[PDB]
């Protein structure tokens, strides 16, 4: 009646040419009393609908490349492309139309694999212009890095923050393969006004410690201000 | 030339209704076996199923919408539409139309229409302010905030367009607040920082509103970095 689908991995990292396998089980059987199991493959590349790749399990759509191939016993059914190409990257879906309502696995994103790289990191006080109208966003960036799994910390005169930063990460960029993020921290002047060092410390693979930038408000030297 | 296209996008109140449209060409909607689906995809919830109306007009509903939606279908221009009533922001998605193509393809969805994004949405239509992320291995990383907008999208460029190398452009957030907020950042030669002008061009055609805000360097700078490797 309400099949859940279980799609695994979330995300799979694969090198160009190499074989890629991904799995969908569904919480109970998904033959129809028919006796025809509908469990279909659907890709979706980056600004794209949704493509049919495979249908009634292990059948080829037409035009879909036979590195392409599905199979399924029981409740475990398994998407296999021989050799995985450039244009085979995107998100891969499983569905089953064979009991309403049917019903969508959750995705799998294939990307590109490729060698750790540790992120440039950048920090920047808010605007003198942002300041007037009664705020400040504080903006960290981390740029060109691999694998995406970054930590990123807001410290406030050594005070973790936490609920006041939202993070925004880009899609793999299509030359190198890497990815940038930016985190921002933002407060009412009142309160940024109140405290002196704003810091975000980076946790990545690519480096050895985590690193920090941070600088110290009402600063940029002066002896006599401003 | 079997094709499914949809209307256009759609922003609207919470508690308010949204018709959206699916006309189909190259085949006979009427052909035995064949059907429409409607599908939605958001941003961290996949696809799920909505609705699915038959070629003898039979239609047939997901319980998660609590009976908010009706499918019609008026043969004349072989067009589906997907009445959804009552919105919430939860509703925010896309929505996609796509064919169940019959018995000869085991019902699976070959054609898909390209989408109609709906945003639910109290916020009125509203330009963005521009701020400026100041300059600070002789490389230097510099950009724009872009802030408390709506709706989607904004386009950003770097002087003209003539700056396109280590450009990135964030994807936008949704503040609590009900606004988008968004960074573009760019890294260049420290050494440019003096005698190179650096403008970022905000566009966003919904409120029809054109900024260009000049980043200039910061005069002095004490940012520290400790760790690392």
């Known amino acids: 009646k309400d099949i859940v689908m279980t799609q695994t991995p979330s995300s799979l990292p694969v090198s160009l040419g190499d074989q890629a396998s991904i799995s969908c089980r569904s919480s109970?059987?998904?033959?129809?009393?028919?006796?025809?199991?509908?469990l279909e493959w659907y890709l979706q590349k980056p600004g794209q609908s949704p493509k049919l790749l495979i249908y009634?399990?292990?059948n080829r759509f037409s035009g879909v490349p036979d590195r392409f191939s599905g199979s399924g016993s029981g409740t475990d059914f398994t998407l296999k492309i021989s050799r995985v190409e450039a244009e085979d990257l995107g998100i891969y879906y499983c569905?089953?139309?064979?009991?309403?309502?049917?019903?969508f696995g959750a995705g799998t994103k294939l990307e590109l694999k490729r060698g750790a790289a540790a992120p440039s990191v950048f920090i920047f006080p808010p605007s003198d212009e942002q300041l007037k109208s009664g705020t400040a966003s504080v903006v960290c960036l981390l740029n060109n890095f691999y694998p995406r799994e970054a930590k990123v910390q807001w410290k406030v005169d050594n005070a973790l923050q936490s609920g006041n930063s939202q993070e925004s990460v880009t899609e793999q960029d299509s030359k190198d393969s890497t990815y940038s993020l930016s985190s921002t921290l933002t407060l009412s002047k009142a309160d940024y006004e109140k405290h002196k060092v704003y810091a975000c410390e980076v946790t990545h693979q690519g480096l050895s410690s985590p690193v920090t930038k941070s600088f110290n408000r009402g600063e940029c030297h002066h002896h006599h201000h401003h | 030339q079997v094709q499914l296209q949809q209307s256009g996008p759609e922003d609207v109140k919470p508690g308010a209704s949204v018709k959206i449209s699916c006309k189909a060409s190259?085949?006979?909607?009427?052909?035995?076996?064949?059907?429409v689906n409607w599908v939605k995809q958001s941003p961290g919830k996949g696809l799920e199923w909505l609705a699915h109306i038959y070629w003898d007009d039979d239609k047939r509903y997901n319980p998660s919408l609590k009976s908010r939606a009706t499918l019609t279908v008026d043969k004349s221009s072989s067009t589906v539409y997907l009445e959804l009533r009552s919105l919430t922001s939860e509703d925010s998605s896309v929505y996609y139309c796509?064919?169940?193509?019959?018995?000869?393809?085991?019902?699976?969805?070959?054609?898909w229409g390209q989408g109609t994004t709906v945003t639910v949405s109290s916020a009125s239509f509203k330009g963005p302010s521009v701020f400026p992320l100041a300059p600070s291995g002789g490389t230097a990383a510099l950009g724009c905030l872009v802030k408390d907008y709506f709706p989607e999208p904004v386009t950003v460029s770097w002087n003209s367009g003539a700056l396109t190398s280590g450009v990135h452009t964030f994807p936008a957030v949704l503040q609590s607040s009900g606004l988008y907020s968004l960074s573009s950042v760019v890294t260049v030669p420290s050494s440019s920082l003096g005698t190179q002008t650096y403008i970022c061009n905000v566009n966003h055609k919904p409120s029809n509103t054109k900024v260009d805000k000049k980043v200039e360097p910061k005069s002095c700078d004490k940012t520290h970095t400790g760790g690392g490797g």
């Open positions: 109970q059987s998904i033959v129809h009393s028919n006796g025809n199991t509908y």
């Open positions: 569905f089953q139309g064979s009991l309403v309502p049917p019903t």
């Open positions: 190259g085949y006979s909607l009427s052909t035995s076996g064949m059907g």
């Open positions: 009634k399990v292990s």
């Open positions: 796509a064919r169940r193509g019959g018995s000869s393809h085991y019902y699976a969805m070959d054609y």
